[PDB]
Design a protein around this ligand. Structure first.
Ligand SMILES: Cc1c2c(c(O)c3c(O)cccc13)C(=O)[C@]1(O)C(=O)C(C(N)=O)=C(O)[C@@H](N(C)C)[C@@H]1C2
Ligand SMILES: Cc1c2c(c(O)c3c(O)cccc13)C(=O)[C@]1(O)C(=O)C(C(N)=O)=C(O)[C@@H](N(C)C)[C@@H]1C2
Ligand SMILES: [Cl-]
Ligand SMILES: [Cl-]
Ligand SMILES: [Cl-]
Ligand SMILES: [Cl-]
Ligand SMILES: [Cl-]
Ligand SMILES: [Cl-]
Ligand SMILES: [Cl-]
Ligand SMILES: [Cl-]
Ligand SMILES: [Mg+2]
Ligand SMILES: [Mg+2]
Lengths: 207, 207
């Protein structure tokens, strides 16, 4: 089939969503694309180049709150941005894994620059605005990775018996699987945002 | 070589640290252990069972602040615990990946129960104490995964040219690679802990 960048990425995303990050092999991508391996290598050099492109395209497709609205508070922007990032990551199996360790792509420069500027315009030093943005990113990636991997593990083997659990852990387990992770994520997200606020408003006051 | 559980895990950890989570294959573990594959399968059924055991043992070896000190504040306990968790995860290549989606093991029940109880004794509802503990865990796992994957990506291919970067992003990149991620992690960690505190102390007050 077509091997423009768009369609290679399309197929890799499909493959990703079907078989997870382990399924993204040269061989399996070539088979999905209906091609021989040397054909694929002309287009895609290695798994890393593919993973980097997927990380970019997952956000291009499904990360729909990447810039602050007019007059938006930094708090509200981090909240909306985090929700959007999470949704984009959850779209595809192992999409959080695919993002890990990437650095913004040239295609994302204007966006991330605007994010960083926006933070600074709201009183954060570049460093502290970056640490806030990093923390939101890290938290969200962790939350998503734990949710997606847990679902994958369920499919492999069952949890161990309930009746040997201590009681708080037993409740906690009910709670965690009472949903897909959203409630815990949103609660943690508010904690994070408020802690950034405490740090910021403190200025040079001990806090 | 020896194929008690301890030594299987030892070898898998070595292999993990040498070749990362992709290197943990039946075949490569059997080769490290000096055995044929059917010998290994007697001991280790599948990659998941192995990954689960590694997640447990990485914390048994190197997670040395799992319980609160006498009279310790919940804040200080989450801080020390998070630092320790991070250190344990960073010990082995892809050790954060190995943890993802796991649930506490029977061997960890008394510890995690104590953690949950401790939170509740400090005024958190079980749910809110769990959300705090989850958030700390998620943040730490994200931070560690991004640090370790970034190091792995460096080895594969170089970052793109500096001179097309916008300036805040260029600075931010200097900052992020000014260290291994510790400074950003510690800063984010304080934000998280303080946000939990704001949430807790608020009681039924709008906050
Ligand atoms: C500013 C920044 C960001 C990201 C990032 O990885 C990063 C970096 O690795 C070094 C220095 C700066 C940044 C994000 O991944 C990203 O997810 C992202 O690319 C991004 C985006 N492209 O829209 C975001 O929305 C941001 N957000 C989840 C907090 C965050 C922004
Ligand atoms: C309480 C709890 C925890 C963990 C966890 O995964 C979990 C769960 O998946 C469901 C319900 C409860 C928990 C941790 O992984 C763990 O890392 C952990 O096992 C753990 C430990 N075994 O010592 C910790 O130190 C904890 N910490 C990093 C906040 C955290 C505690
Ligand atoms: Cl083509
Ligand atoms: Cl294209
Ligand atoms: Cl607003
Ligand atoms: Cl503010
Ligand atoms: Cl033996
Ligand atoms: Cl043993
Ligand atoms: Cl204390
Ligand atoms: Cl308190
Ligand atoms: Mg990123
Ligand atoms: Mg865990």
């Amino acid at each position: 089939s077509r091997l423009n960048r768009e369609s290679v990425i399309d197929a890799a995303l499909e493959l990703l969503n079907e078989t997870g990050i382990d399924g993204l092999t040269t061989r399996k991508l070539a088979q999905k694309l209906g091609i021989e391996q040397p054909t694929l290598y002309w287009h895609v050099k290695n798994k890393r180049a593919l993973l980097d492109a997927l990380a970019v395209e997952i956000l291009a497709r499904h990360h729909d709150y990447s810039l602050p609205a007019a007059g938006e508070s930094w708090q509200s922007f981090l909240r909306n941005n985090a929700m959007s990032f999470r949704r984009a990551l959850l779209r595809y199996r192992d999409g959080a894994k695919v993002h890990l360790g990437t650095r913004p792509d040239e295609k994302q420069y204007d966006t991330v620059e605007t994010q960083l500027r926006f933070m600074t315009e709201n009183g954060f030093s570049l460093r502290d605005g970056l640490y806030a943005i990093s923390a939101v990113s890290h938290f969200t990636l962790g939350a998503v990775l734990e949710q997606q991997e847990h679902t994958a593990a369920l499919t492999d083997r069952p949890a161990a018996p309930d009746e040997n659990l201590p009681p708080l852990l037993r409740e906690a387990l009910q709670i965690m699987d009472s949903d897909d992770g959203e409630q815990a994520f949103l609660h943690g997200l508010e904690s994070l945002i408020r802690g950034f606020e405490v740090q910021l408003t403190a200025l040079l006051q001990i806090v």
